Amino acid sequence: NLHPIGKIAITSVHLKLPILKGLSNDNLSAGAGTMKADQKMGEGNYALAGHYMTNQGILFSPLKNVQTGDTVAITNMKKVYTYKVTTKQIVNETQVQWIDDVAGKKLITLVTCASPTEGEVDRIIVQGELQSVKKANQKNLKIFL
């Protein structure tokens, strides 16, 4: 009953998760939560956060293995938005500007803890630039199966 609004896939690290609205603890434990109220796929800077791991095991920790040039795809089941990773950084939690819209860019920004340890102050940031928007047909949706 979290009601996913989409899905994210990063084939390079075998990540496939629901996208959920907002950063509730439940959302962050189940998938990628939207970091801003008003963001839209394929527009501005689409920001998503998830826990590094849960009780069960890994969640967003595979971000640590994502490299520049990797593709990240999201869908709302209407269109598929494919982004190409332009940076991966470990930053301090205070660097909130990473999720801000950037004039003349269409970005995705993925955020998780730098580690599972108590009171971790650092975050893994994976950011990418929109490469394509395609109709959510069988061919383009396959990667989300």
Coordinates of C-alpha atoms in Angstrom, one line a residue:
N1 CA 0.0 0.0 0.0
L2 CA 2.9 2.4 -0.8
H3 CA 1.4 3.0 -4.3
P4 CA 4.5 3.1 -6.7
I5 CA 4.3 5.9 -9.3
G6 CA 7.0 4.4 -11.6
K7 CA 10.0 2.2 -11.8
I8 CA 13.8 2.7 -12.1
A9 CA 16.3 0.3 -13.8
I10 CA 20.1 0.5 -13.9
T11 CA 21.1 -2.6 -15.9
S12 CA 24.8 -2.1 -15.2
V13 CA 24.3 -2.9 -11.5
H14 CA 21.2 -5.1 -11.9
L15 CA 19.0 -2.5 -10.0
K16 CA 15.3 -2.6 -10.6
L17 CA 13.1 -0.8 -8.0
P18 CA 9.7 1.0 -7.7
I19 CA 9.7 4.8 -7.6
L20 CA 7.4 6.1 -4.8
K21 CA 6.2 9.6 -3.9
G22 CA 8.1 11.2 -1.0
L23 CA 10.8 10.2 1.4
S24 CA 8.9 8.3 4.0
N25 CA 11.0 5.7 5.8
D26 CA 8.8 3.0 4.2
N27 CA 9.4 4.4 0.7
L28 CA 13.2 4.6 1.3
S29 CA 13.2 1.0 2.4
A30 CA 11.2 -0.3 -0.6
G31 CA 12.6 1.7 -3.5
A32 CA 13.5 5.1 -4.8
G33 CA 11.5 8.0 -3.2
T34 CA 11.0 11.3 -5.0
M35 CA 13.0 14.0 -3.2
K36 CA 10.8 17.0 -4.4
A37 CA 7.0 17.4 -4.4
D38 CA 6.7 18.9 -7.9
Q39 CA 9.3 17.1 -10.1
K40 CA 8.4 15.4 -13.4
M41 CA 10.2 12.6 -15.3
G42 CA 12.2 14.1 -18.2
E43 CA 12.1 17.6 -16.8
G44 CA 14.4 19.7 -14.6
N45 CA 16.3 17.6 -12.0
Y46 CA 14.4 14.5 -11.2
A47 CA 15.7 13.5 -7.7
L48 CA 15.4 10.1 -6.0
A49 CA 16.6 8.8 -2.7
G50 CA 16.8 5.3 -1.2
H51 CA 18.3 3.6 1.8
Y52 CA 21.8 2.0 1.2
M53 CA 20.4 -1.2 2.7
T54 CA 17.6 -2.6 4.8
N55 CA 17.2 -5.5 7.2
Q56 CA 16.7 -7.7 4.2
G57 CA 19.8 -6.7 2.3
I58 CA 20.9 -4.2 -0.3
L59 CA 18.6 -1.5 -1.7
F60 CA 20.3 1.6 -3.3
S61 CA 23.9 0.4 -2.4
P62 CA 24.5 -0.7 -6.0
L63 CA 24.8 3.0 -6.9
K64 CA 28.4 2.7 -5.5
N65 CA 29.2 0.5 -8.6
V66 CA 27.5 2.8 -11.2
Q67 CA 30.0 4.4 -13.5
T68 CA 30.0 7.5 -15.8
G69 CA 28.5 6.5 -19.1
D70 CA 26.1 4.0 -17.6
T71 CA 22.4 4.4 -18.4
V72 CA 19.6 4.8 -15.9
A73 CA 16.0 4.4 -17.1
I74 CA 12.8 5.4 -15.4
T75 CA 9.2 5.0 -16.4
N76 CA 5.7 6.0 -15.3
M77 CA 4.3 3.3 -17.7
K78 CA 3.5 6.1 -20.3
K79 CA 7.0 7.0 -21.4
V80 CA 10.5 5.6 -20.7
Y81 CA 13.1 8.3 -19.8
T82 CA 16.8 7.1 -20.3
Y83 CA 19.6 9.1 -18.7
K84 CA 23.3 8.7 -19.1
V85 CA 25.4 9.0 -15.9
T86 CA 27.7 12.0 -16.1
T87 CA 29.0 11.9 -12.5
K88 CA 29.3 9.8 -9.4
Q89 CA 30.5 11.5 -6.2
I90 CA 30.6 10.9 -2.5
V91 CA 29.5 14.2 -0.9
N92 CA 28.5 15.5 2.6
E93 CA 24.8 15.3 3.4
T94 CA 24.7 19.1 3.6
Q95 CA 25.2 19.4 -0.2
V96 CA 21.4 19.7 -0.9
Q97 CA 22.0 21.7 -4.1
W98 CA 22.6 18.5 -6.0
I99 CA 18.8 18.1 -6.3
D100 CA 18.1 21.6 -7.7
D101 CA 16.8 22.1 -11.2
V102 CA 19.6 23.3 -13.5
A103 CA 18.7 25.8 -16.3
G104 CA 19.0 24.2 -19.7
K105 CA 19.6 20.7 -18.4
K106 CA 17.4 17.7 -17.9
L107 CA 18.9 15.6 -15.1
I108 CA 18.3 12.6 -12.8
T109 CA 20.0 12.7 -9.4
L110 CA 20.1 9.5 -7.3
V111 CA 21.1 9.8 -3.6
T112 CA 21.9 7.2 -0.9
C113 CA 24.1 6.8 2.2
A114 CA 27.8 6.4 1.6
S115 CA 27.6 3.3 3.9
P116 CA 25.2 1.5 6.2
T117 CA 27.0 2.6 9.4
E118 CA 25.2 4.6 12.2
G119 CA 25.4 8.4 11.7
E120 CA 26.9 8.3 8.2
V121 CA 27.3 11.9 7.1
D122 CA 28.3 11.2 3.5
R123 CA 26.1 10.4 0.5
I124 CA 26.7 8.7 -2.8
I125 CA 25.4 10.9 -5.6
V126 CA 24.9 9.5 -9.1
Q127 CA 23.7 12.2 -11.6
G128 CA 22.9 11.8 -15.3
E129 CA 21.6 13.8 -18.3
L130 CA 18.5 12.8 -20.3
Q131 CA 19.4 10.8 -23.5
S132 CA 16.0 9.9 -24.7
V133 CA 12.2 9.8 -24.1
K134 CA 10.5 6.9 -25.7
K135 CA 6.9 5.5 -25.7
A136 CA 6.4 2.9 -23.0
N137 CA 5.9 -0.1 -25.4
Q138 CA 6.8 -3.7 -25.0
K139 CA 10.2 -3.2 -26.5
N140 CA 11.1 -0.2 -24.1
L141 CA 9.4 -1.7 -21.0
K142 CA 11.3 -5.1 -21.2
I143 CA 14.1 -3.7 -19.1
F144 CA 11.7 -3.2 -16.2
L145 CA 10.6 -6.8 -16.0

